Design a protein around this ligand. Structure first.
Ligand SMILES: *[C@@H]1O[C@H](CO)[C@@H](O)[C@H](O)[C@H]1NC(C)=O
Ligand SMILES: *[C@@H]1O[C@H](CO)[C@@H](O)[C@H](O)[C@H]1NC(C)=O
Ligand SMILES: *[C@@H]1O[C@H](CO)[C@@H](O)[C@H](O)[C@H]1NC(C)=O
Ligand SMILES: *[C@@H]1O[C@H](CO)[C@@H](O)[C@H](O)[C@H]1NC(C)=O
Length: 263
């Protein structure tokens, strides 16, 4: 069927590995954050139609800088992306999930706000969640509590419980092989293995420390391709991205790859 959510040119490995997607990106600081500490909104100026919204949360002690690279990278492919700072840098996963969802709520509110740069740019029914470490755990809590979310793609996630068997949202877990903060064997892989009801994927970056998917990482072509492909496939229902979303990269930079129920 004609997909009313399809945006942008037909993807290629090259187009998805590039630093920038097809759309021009602008950004603004949120003047009065509603339910979180601070936020930057990244948006395409020329997507050609309304686009989904993604909210991204940092890890413990961390700020927008740790996750900022996702803002332009995703927005340039046709998303409105909010990177947040938490109320406290020492907020835990449940609080991070609440704040992530408050950020999505504010982006949806701004779609209806005539003074906003994202006035009329958002499809409030199509949302995604991403984040690092405790903000990754928070993303999985967000998905568990809000199953109408269309996609989740946390990185090096941690939560006090690894049991996300209730999650029905398509979930891509970025993991870091040599993580010594939230070891893969005790955190990311148990989380991945808990999820039985969803499309899901596990992508472990070989030799990576806990920060392996953060701003300034040396694998932006692969990690950015996978994140954009997952969000395109599931937030936009865009089957042009089915092979990019589901494929094993068969990459010497990937130490572990798993996927299930992917189409
Ligand atoms: C974040 O702080 C705002 C402002 O005080 C508040 O409305 C919100 O409830 C806080 N969120 C959490 C999860 O503590
Ligand atoms: C966002 O606003 C635009 C223009 O007013 C509108 O066409 C669109 O439906 C809105 N989004 C949602 C999800 O209602
Ligand atoms: C996770 O929680 C579900 C729901 O209680 C339970 O049936 C299951 O045993 C737990 N799963 C794991 C993977 O420990
Ligand atoms: C991985 O290899 C399989 C089997 O040869 C192939 O179907 C798939 O395209 C490969 N992935 C990439 C990125 O080429």
């Amino acid at each position: 069927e004609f997909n009313p959510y399809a945006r942008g040119p037909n993807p290629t490995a090259a187009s998805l590995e590039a630093s920038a997607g097809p759309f021009t990106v602008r950004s603004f600081t949120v003047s009065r954050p509603s339910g979180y500490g601070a936020g930057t909104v990244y948006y395409p100026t020329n997507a050609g139609g309304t686009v989904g919204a993604i909210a991204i949360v940092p890890g413990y002690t961390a700020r927008q800088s740790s996750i900022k690279w996702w803002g332009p990278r995703l927005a340039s492919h046709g998303f409105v992306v909010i990177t947040i700072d938490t109320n406290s840098t020492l907020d835990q996963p449940e609080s991070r999930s609440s704040q992530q969802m408050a950020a999505l709520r504010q982006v949806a509110s701004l779609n209806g706000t005539s003074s906003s740069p994202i006035y009329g740019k958002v499809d409030t029914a199509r949302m995604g969640v991403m984040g690092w470490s405790m903000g990754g755990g928070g993303s999985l809590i967000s998905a568990a509590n809000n199953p109408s979310l269309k996609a989740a793609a946390p990185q090096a996630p941690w939560h006090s419980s690894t049991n996300f068997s209730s999650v029905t949202v398509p979930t891509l877990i970025f993991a870091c092989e040599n993580d010594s903060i939230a070891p893969v064997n005790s955190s990311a892989l148990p989380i991945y293995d808990s999820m039985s009801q969803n499309a899901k994927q596990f992508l472990e970056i070989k030799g990576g420390s806990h920060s392996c998917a953060n701003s300034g990482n040396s694998n932006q072509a692969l990690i950015g391709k996978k994140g954009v492909a997952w969000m395109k496939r599931f937030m936009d229902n865009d089957t042009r991205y089915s092979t990019f979303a589901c494929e094993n990269p068969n990459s010497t930079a990937v130490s572990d790859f798993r996927t299930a129920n992917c189409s």
